[PDB]
């Protein structure tokens, strides 16, 4: 086509989706990770994670307002990944890398798994 | 913070939101523009448009599944702008520029209004 493109559009959309999440506006699911709860938008979760894409395209699970993650999932690791989904920013640290990588593998977030593997290999 | 950032993340999220729209997955509103209907995600509309941001933060309108636009709004102009919202790509042409600009003004999409004004000024 003969379209023009606005370079910052995708980033501005994601910034606004994050602002809606922070104000709990039109959030439609709560992700339970042991004792912790995280409110989010199903569409953003699906757009970032192979696991959520599978869950919310399921004819029964698409209608659930609560999703309980595997008890082995670390809430801080999930929080870091949820923040990444809404911002493109990953708070990767020596103290959280193992939890972040394990959570990204479970959530099926290949690019996060890739950078975690690379950061781990560099420290050995 | 000491975060790392994935450059393509925002673009990949928007590409997936557009794929969900094309397959009518978790779309939660229909925008009626005279004889035409457009299914979309309220969160994406709010993230791109000052008008939809106002509509869906309203305590009554946030719950509506159908929104009827002003009868002066051109469906093709709306279609072009809805595509822009989900892709960052604007199909701006001599034959549609006036409708696109009028629709962007109504939808409160300042960056689109700006490029339309610039393209019009160049042709006079």
């Amino acid at each position: 086509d003969s379209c023009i493109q606005f370079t910052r559009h995708a980033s501005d959309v994601l910034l606004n989706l994050n602002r809606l999440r922070s104000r709990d506006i039109l959030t439609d699911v709560v992700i339970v990770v042991s004792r912790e709860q995280f409110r989010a938008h199903k569409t953003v979760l699906m757009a970032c994670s192979g696991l959520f894409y599978s869950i919310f395209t399921d004819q029964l699970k698409c209608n659930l307002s609560v999703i309980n993650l595997d008890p082995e999932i670390n809430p801080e690791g999930f929080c870091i990944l949820l923040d990444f989904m809404y911002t493109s920013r990953l708070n990767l640290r020596e103290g959280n890398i193992m939890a972040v990588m394990a959570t990204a593998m479970y959530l099926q977030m290949e690019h996060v798994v890739d950078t975690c593997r690379k950061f781990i290999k560099a420290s050995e | 913070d000491s975060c790392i950032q994935f450059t393509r993340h925002a673009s990949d999220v928007l590409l997936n939101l557009n794929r969900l729209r094309s397959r009518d997955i978790l779309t939660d509103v229909v925008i009626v523009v005279s004889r035409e209907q457009f299914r979309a995600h309220k969160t994406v509309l709010m993230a791109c448009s000052g008008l939809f941001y106002s509509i869906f933060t309203d305590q009554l309108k946030c719950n509506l599944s159908v929104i009827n636009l002003d009868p002066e709004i051109n469906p093709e102009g709306f279609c072009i702008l809805l595509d822009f919202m989900y892709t960052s790509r604007l199909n701006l042409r001599e034959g549609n520029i006036m409708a696109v600009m009028a629709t962007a003004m109504y939808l409160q999409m300042e960056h689109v209004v700006d490029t339309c004004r610039k393209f019009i000024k160049a042709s006079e």
């Binding site: 379209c3 023009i4 493109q5 606005f6 370079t7 | 790509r89 604007l90 960056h111 490029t115």
Partner: peptide, 4 residues
């Protein structure tokens, strides 16, 4: 705005 750019030509993509």
């Amino acid at each position: 705005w750019v030509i993509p």
